[PDB]
Design a protein around this ligand. Sequence first.
Ligand code: CLA
Ligand code: CLA
Ligand code: CLA
Ligand SMILES: CC(/C=C/C=C(C)/C=C/[C@@]12O[C@]1(C)C[C@@H](O)CC2(C)C)=C\C=C\C=C(C)\C=C\C=C(C)\C=C\[C@@]12O[C@]1(C)C[C@@H](O)CC2(C)C
Lengths: 42, 49, 197, 156, 43, 211
Amino acid sequence: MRDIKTYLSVAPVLSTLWFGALAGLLIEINRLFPDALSFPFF
Amino acid sequence: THAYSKALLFLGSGSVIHSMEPLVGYSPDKSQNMVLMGGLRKYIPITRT
Amino acid sequence: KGSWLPGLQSPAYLDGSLAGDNGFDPLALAEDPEDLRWFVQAELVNGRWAMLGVAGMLIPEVLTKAGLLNAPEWYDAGKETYFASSSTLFVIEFILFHYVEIRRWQDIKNPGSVNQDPIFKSYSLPPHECGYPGSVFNPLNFAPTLENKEKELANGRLAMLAFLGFLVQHNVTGKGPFENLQQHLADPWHNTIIQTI
Amino acid sequence: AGLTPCKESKAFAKREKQSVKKLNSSLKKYAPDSAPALAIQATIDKTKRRFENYGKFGLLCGSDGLPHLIVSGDQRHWGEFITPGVLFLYIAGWIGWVGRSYLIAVSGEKKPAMREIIIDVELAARIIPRGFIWPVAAYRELINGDLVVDDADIGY
Amino acid sequence: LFPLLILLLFTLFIGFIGISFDNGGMDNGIAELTILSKWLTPS
Amino acid sequence: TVCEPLGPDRPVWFPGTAPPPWLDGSLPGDFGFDPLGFGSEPESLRWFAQAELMHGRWAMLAVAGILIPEILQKWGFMEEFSWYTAGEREYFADPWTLFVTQMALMGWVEGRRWMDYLNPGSVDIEPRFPNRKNPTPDVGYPGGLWFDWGNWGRGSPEPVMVLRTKEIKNGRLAMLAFVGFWFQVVYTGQGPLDNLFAHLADPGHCNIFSA
Ligand code: CLA
Ligand code: CLA
Ligand code: CLA
Ligand SMILES: CC(/C=C/C=C(C)/C=C/[C@@]12O[C@]1(C)C[C@@H](O)CC2(C)C)=C\C=C\C=C(C)\C=C\C=C(C)\C=C\[C@@]12O[C@]1(C)C[C@@H](O)CC2(C)C
């Protein structure tokens, strides 16, 4: 079990999941704010 | 109001009796007689409040 | 002392000597002692001025809505017309503060240096404790004891929180917070952050 | 330099009109209820409200009907560079500081390469959220000179 | 002790049945505020 | 604490098979069923045990809340209609207010419980009048007359492991029941009692294969 944990902590899979989460966040932001060119908050 | 306000007191009295009953003999009028009892705030708080 | 987490062990940074210790550093910022001192002073000053500000927000609002007085909102007081124009009082503020705060900082860098009013040589100052100045600040001879520093810091932290609340609620609403309280008391369920979005 | 905002210019309106026109002409080749046609109308109103939003935030607008940023420093047009710039600088400082702190920490082991290929995800998790300190912390570092080195170059 | 505690919970809340006759006590709290809950009684 | 090692005391979930060695059978409800060996290491084992207990209790509450109102609708006085459609039922307040209040209070409670798990005994609610010595803990069974006022989890009414076995078994069953109810409503459009009676009338045909 702990072996599969140390394997999961190997940079490829960690990086893939991290990048997937980041891309999901970005595409969701783009969905909720289409075309988002300026900073119309301040 | 009085239903609960008295049932609580009866149950509390039962608890006080059974708490002090090991110190005096197993006997009514040797327990449940609050003149040789008296002062229990330090020993059993949850059944005192 | 009161670790705000009944199971977590307090880090060595916040032993309990300084007032208001609860081991409340889940990010290990002040683990360096001099930076801990820095943030102590910063929390002190922020809390004091936050108490000041939250008073100046709340009390005028209620005294105006009570009909006893008449004074604009803290945000509606800028455009108001006074005996002095904005820039004048602002530059006077700037010079006076660039005196006072730079003296404060010199005291911070050097314990017990800038003590005396350098104008006259008597009347000057009794040696102080950093963050808790001497005579001319505590005229009523209040003893700087515990349960005073703790109360100060707790009230100041809550004051900071309340001030940030004032600011963000004015952002989302632009209305008087006491009016928000009245609407709240009308129906806390129909009046909250949820409906206003 | 004469760039009118397309809240008032015309070529912007012409671009908007031509875009919605070609979209609408494409729309009339299906059932008025087909989900593809529905998404087409959705994108139509979406680009429409985009044109509207652009006509709300002082966007100075070219002589050909196109937005044009104004990064000259005047905070009047700051919702393009200054605030997003400092926001991204905050993010980048976050990342740089957290990475540097992780590495400085994990340096003290037997062969740090084994933890540089396979991250100490526990230490990584208890080091990562420190980003809120990256401006101030590094600050003190430079104050105390514990950020740079003088004549230690190779080895460590 | 469990029944003692649960009944202590009763000997304080029950007073809110006929709480008072002066505007009830609150302008909010639509849970039968000033309509005091002894409305089961005649009519 | 009684152990259930191999042998007749160990009725194996798969007859004629030696159970995994690291499955001793201490935890009530054990039968040596972990072909995936997720319980390989002890920390994972206890973590999964806690997860199992929590899931079982919550599933019991959920299946009770499904079942009882629907039957009290079918025949009882008040008619509680489709529970699966009660999620969108309209109340005094909006669902998001309910959500945030639920999250606040449950976060408070479950966080205290989380700290108790990470640090046993360090977060407990058990008053101490003088001279009466309190009970310890076995996390997952807090004890004291807050969650055991009937004095059932300690001795007299039944040897402990047997009662915990009852609990874990009924909890697994209730988990199956909840997932079954949900999956049925995904497929069919009635409650559990309705499917039940429909199966009673026509057992031979009124089934999943009825269409
Ligand atoms: C002293 C602290 C304080 C107090 C008394 C209030 C009070 C209030 N806030 Mg508020 N607020 C605060 C801090 C505070 N806020 C802070 C720090 C923020 C920024 C995150 C906000 C952001 C905020 C928004 C965006 C809105 C309110 C609104 C409101 C009002 C309705 C309550 C509501 O919608 O939930 C308040 C919502 C929050 C996010 C507040 C979170 C405050 C944190 C959790 C600390 C407070 C914990 C504190 C110990 C518990 C309350 C103390 C109180 C019983 C004395 C109410 C008068 C609403 C309003 O005006 O409509 C009527 C509204 O739209 N607040
Ligand atoms: C947090 C780690 C970190 C930090 C603080 C820096 C800092 C710096 N790098 Mg750099 N670098 C890094 C990682 C890092 N690097 C990595 C991983 C690579 C290989 C891809 C490079 C490749 C690189 C080159 C080729 C150059 C620099 C340069 C520089 C300097 C100027 C900034 C610049 O041009 O960067 C530009 C930005 C990048 C190159 C992007 C790299 C940043 C990566 C993506 C972040 C890595 C984070 C970590 C691996 C993820 C783990 C997260 C955590 C949970 C552990 C500055 C001192 C320049 C220099 O010499 O200046 C004098 C230069 O020419 N870097
Ligand atoms: C306690 C377990 C249990 C029980 C008693 C039932 C009972 C029933 N289900 Mg059901 N179901 C279950 C679990 C269960 N289900 C699970 C886990 C799922 C998810 C896959 C489903 C999905 C499902 C659908 C989609 C439908 C039913 C339907 C029905 C009803 C008609 C029988 C039928 O055609 O389905 C037979 C059920 C299955 C093939 C599901 C297999 C899974 C169970 C667990 C089989 C194992 C048997 C069990 C472990 C041994 C008995 C334990 C205990 C009851 C003694 C009947 C009342 C139908 C309905 O609505 O009635 C009209 C229908 O359309 N079920
Ligand atoms: C909230 C705040 C700081 C909060 C920081 C917190 C909680 C940090 C917490 C942490 O670091 C710790 C503890 C430990 C870490 O491991 C975890 C985190 C979480 C990182 C400061 C507010 C500080 C707020 C302050 C100082 C407010 C001052 C207000 C003033 C002076 C008001 C002035 C006015 O009202 C008048 C006077 C007159 C009016 O008319 C006009 C104006 C000008 C508006």
